[PDB]
C-alpha cells in the first residue's frame, strides 16, 4: 500500500510515448478520485471521477492555471466500480493525453499546457487504496 494523497515525481516532465500506470482499488462507497498532472502549481491535466454528482457518475477533466479552473470536459462512460481493483493508464501523445482504464480506451484530453517537459509531478488523491504508480516508455 501507498499513502494517499501521493506524489509521483515525473523527472524532466512528460514526453510523447511516456505511459503512466496507476494501480489501486476503489474504496467501497467512494465519492471521488483525482489525478493531477502538475506544472508547478498549475494542473496541466486533472482527471476526476465523481461517483455521485446529482446521482450520476461522471468523469470530469480540466486544467488549472494561476489557481483558476478552465472549461470542463465531461465523459459519462464510467469504468470504475466501488470496491474493485483498477488500472489507469495515461499515455502522453503529441497533441493529447490518452486515458485507458482496465485496458479499455476511455478518453483523450488535448494539451492546454504546452511545456510538457515541465509537467514534473503526478498527484493522486481520493477514495482509493493505492498500490502502484510508475511510468515507462512504449
Ligand atoms: O470545491 C469543490 O466543491 C469542487 O472542486 C472541484 C475541483 N476539485 C476537485 C478536487 C478533489 C480534491 C481531492 F482531494 C480529491 F480526492 C478529489 F477526488 C478531487 N479538488 N478540486 C475540480 O474537480 C474542478 C474541475 O473543474 O471542479 C470543481 S471546482 C469548479 C466548480 C465549478 C466549475 Cl464551473 C469549475 Cl470549472 C470548477
Ligand atoms: Cl470532485
Ligand atoms: Na527546468
Swiss-Prot record:
A major expression is found in the colonic epithelium. It is also abundant in the activated macrophages. Expressed in fetal membranes. A motif (Nuclear export signal) lies at residues 114-129. GO terms for biological process: eosinophil chemotaxis; epithelial cell differentiation; innate immune response; macrophage chemotaxis; monocyte chemotaxis; mononuclear cell migration; mRNA processing; negative regulation of endocytosis. It is found in: Cytoplasm; Nucleus; Secreted. The keyword Disulfide bond applies. GO terms for cellular component: cell surface; collagen-containing extracellular matrix; cytoplasm; cytosol; extracellular exosome; extracellular region; extracellular space; ficolin-1-rich granule membrane. The keyword Repeat applies. GO terms for molecular function: carbohydrate binding; chemoattractant activity; disaccharide binding; IgE binding; laminin binding; molecular condensate scaffold activity; protein phosphatase binding; protein phosphatase inhibitor activity. Coiled coil: none annotated. It comes from the Eukaryota. A beta-D-galactoside binds at residues 69-75. The modification Phosphoserine is found at residue 76. Keywords: Acetylation, Cytoplasm, Differentiation, Disulfide bond, IgE-binding protein, Immunity, Innate immunity, Lectin, mRNA processing, mRNA splicing, Nucleus, Phosphoprotein, Repeat, Secreted, Spliceosome. Residues 6-136 form the Galectin domain. Galactose-specific lectin which binds IgE. May mediate with the alpha-3, beta-1 integrin the stimulation by CSPG4 of endothelial cells migration. Together with DMBT1, required for terminal differentiation of columnar epithelial cells during early embryogenesis. In the nucleus: acts as a pre-mRNA splicing factor. Involved in acute inflammatory responses including neutrophil activation and adhesion, chemoattraction of monocytes macrophages, opsonization of apoptotic neutrophils, and activation of mast cells. Probably forms homo- or heterodimers. Interacts with DMBT1. Interacts with CD6 and ALCAM. Forms a complex with the ITGA3, ITGB1 and CSPG4. Interacts with LGALS3BP, LYPD3, ZFTRAF1 and UACA. Interacts with TRIM16; this interaction mediates autophagy of damage endomembranes. Interacts with cargo receptor TMED10; the interaction mediates the translocation from the cytoplasm into the ERGIC (endoplasmic reticulum-Golgi intermediate compartment) and thereby secretion. This is Galectin-3. It comes from Homo sapiens (Human). The lineage of its organism: Eukaryota, Metazoa, Chordata, Craniata, Vertebrata. The chain holds residues 113 to 250 of 250 of the full protein.
Amino acid at each position: 500500500p501507498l499513502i494517499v494523497p501521493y506524489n509521483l515525481p515525473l523527472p524532466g516532465g512528460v514526453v510523447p510515448r511516456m505511459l503512466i500506470t496507476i494501480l489501486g482499488t476503489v474504496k467501497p462507497n467512494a465519492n471521488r478520485i483525482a489525478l493531477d498532472f502538475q506544472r508547478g502549481n498549475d494542473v496541466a491535466f486533472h482527471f476526476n471521477p465523481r461517483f455521485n454528482e446529482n446521482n450520476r457518475r461522471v468523469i470530469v477533466c480540466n486544467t488549472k492555471l494561476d489557481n483558476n479552473w478552465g472549461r470542463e470536459e465531461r465523459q459519462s462512460v464510467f469504468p470504475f466500480e466501488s470496491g474493485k481493483p483498477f488500472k489507469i493508464q495515461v499515455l502522453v501523445e503529441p497533441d493529447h493525453f490518452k486515458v485507458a482504464v482496465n485496458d479499455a480506451h476511455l478518453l483523450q484530453y488535448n494539451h492546454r499546457v504546452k511545456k510538457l517537459n515541465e509537467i514534473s509531478k503526478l498527484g493522486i488523491s481520493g477514495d482509493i487504496d493505492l498500490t502502484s504508480a510508475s511510468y515507462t516508455m512504449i
